[PDB]
């Protein structure tokens with residue numbers, strides 16, 4: 001229980017960007033999603049607010065965590081835990097104080113926890129091009145993200161797993177709609193449109209008497225939560241470098257395994273997936289320049305100046321990867 | 327037979343005796359009408375479809391329409407197929423659509439309601455059904471019709487697209503998905519709005535033939551075409567229309583009985599103890615069907631005139647049955 005001692009100390013960092021999430025995964029016996037979600041629910045008093053029985057919460061979290069694949073290098077329970085914790089920090093930004101209801105906060109955190117559950121470690125395009133059962137089920141449209149939702153919600157029906165048992169019917173209906181809207185927005189094929197829309201919101205931003213964002217209709221509220229969880233999902237390059245490099249190692253392993261399957265099938269290999277013609281560093285610089293920095297610069301503008309340190313880390317990490325190329 | 331062959335000679339006419347064909351074919355209207363249309367359009371030779379594969383697939387697809395559902399069954403599928411087939415021949419749409427596009431619209435029509443349980447998307451969502459859980463409350467039925475229609479191609483000797491090339495299959499699949507998802511009635515208003523916009527910006531030859539240069543406009547027309555076909559019952563000869571009304575009302579009343587037995591709020595038009603069938607048809611025509619078909623008729627002006635005339639006659643008749 002020295003191990004439990006150290007785990008408890010590490011979970012004291014749950015409100016901090018840069019949590020030692022890989023250490024928590026080891027110290028908790030490969031239960032980072034369970035222990036980080038439980039910590040955040042206690043920190044936000046969500047069990048009391050929503051009358052969630054503790055044993056039900058733990059049972060659901062352990063079953064949800066079990067349905068992430070332990071043999072996928074990137075899209076596994078550690079990624080889920082990281083996106084949950086990152087969403088939890090973004091929800092606490094001063095520019096959003098008292099903006100979201102407890103139900104919206106619960107939706108964003110739950111959506112983050114389930115948002116990649118049962119991910120097979122290959123992309124939507126691979127699933128479509130190989131005529132997979134998932135792509136047949138979902139008509140080639142947000143194939144993975146529709147699946148993550150269906151699994152995350154189906155698991156609430158397992159024994160002693162219904163963590164929403166004491167919500168009203170209107171609360172359950174609202175939560176389900178918001179969770180669906182959020183997880184579907186994590187489909188990377190939606191990124192350009194989602195960013196375009198966020199830029200429009202920044203350009204037309206309204207702030208209250210108190211200085212917080214004014215969001216007075218469902219469309220604006222859900223758009224901010226969609227972009228919040230998308231930013232959390234695309235947060236690896238904004239983390240301290242020792243965390244970022246481990247995430248890069250993991251995504252490259254997953255990509256290379258996909259590319260090996262493409263090469264064996266005689267398919268064209270997807271970008272970044274060819275281990276015999278990879279440039280890992282150039283790929284991260286491009287990822288930051290074309291995707292991650294445009295997104296995070298816009299989020300930082302929305303909540304200015306709250307996210308300045310995050311943006312500074314992203315820019316430093318870009319400079320570091322760039323410097324390894326020449 | 328023989329009478330069935332005589333009935334099928336009207337395959338190119340609005341008002342085919344589809345119920346008679348259902349009876350004469352041993353409850354195989356979808357198979358015999360699809361087979362007839364693939365011949366009339368030379369689609370088996372154009373796409374190198376083996377006739378036995380075609381028949382095997384059609385019989386399997388038709389088997390996955392429910393025979394105990396009064397409206398959304400194989401006779402409705404056959405009717406929508408044949409209606410699309412006629413609309414594809416609107417003179418104003420001449421030279422617009424490729425043969426792959428024609429194949430996609432016809433195939434989409436055939437599968438567009440397969441495995442329909444006879445209850446609405448809202449019912450499926452509110453009863454927390456397995457389908458709504460699978461599809462995240464979004465176009466629940468239409469996603470399932472697609473998934474079943476395509477999965478059945480994988481049954482033994484059922485792949486009617488086996489000799490399409492790789493790109494053709496991918497393009498057909500995309501178009502079919504885009505068309506069937508557009509048949510979700512919750513999308514009607516947006517679809518009609520886009521049809522109106524196309525009518526306003528419409529470009530035609532000197533003889534009034536539609537010019538549609540981009541895929542977006544062409545798939546919108548195919549979406550509205552199959553939606554018109556899906557909503558064509560009130561434009562058919564009255565003896566046909568009244569049978570479709572009887573069937574949809576039975577299906578609605580059965581859904582309302584389930585909603586009552588479960589203690590749910592009964593859906594509009596679904597309460598057999600508080601129904602006005604005729605007023606509901608007049609409202610359906612006034613608010614949904616006639617705006618849609620008037621816009622279609624403007625897009626193809628004036629080739630839809632006879633269809634629109636029948637719709638207007640039928641509206642007048644149903645109104646006269648209200649005291």
Ligand SMILES: COc1cc2c(cc1OC)[C@H](Cc1c[nH]c3c(Cl)cccc13)N(C=O)CC2
Nearest residue numbers: 188189191236237247248251272283284287291
């Ligand atoms: C640490 O490094 C990485 C992490 C991740 C990715 C790529 C990384 O490094 C190049 C890709 C991003 C992505 C793929 N397609 C996209 C489209 Cl189409 C739009 C936006 C983002 C993406 N991911 C999953 O595949 C998410 C995690």
Ligand SMILES: COc1cc2c(cc1OC)[C@H](Cc1c[nH]c3c(Cl)cccc13)N(C=O)CC2
Nearest residue numbers: 511512514559560570571574595606607610614
């Ligand atoms: C013969 O008479 C009928 C036939 C049909 C319907 C209604 C009829 O008579 C009132 C409804 C129409 C419909 C239901 N919700 C809609 C929405 Cl939300 C928008 C547009 C149309 C609809 N259908 C399916 O349920 C299609 C067939």
Ligand SMILES: [Mg+2]
Nearest residue numbers: 115116144186
């Ligand atoms: Mg994902």
Ligand SMILES: [Mg+2]
Nearest residue numbers: 438439467509
């Ligand atoms: Mg339908």
Ligand SMILES: [Zn+2]
Nearest residue numbers: 079115116233
């Ligand atoms: Zn993710």
Ligand SMILES: [Zn+2]
Nearest residue numbers: 402438439556
């Ligand atoms: Zn239909």
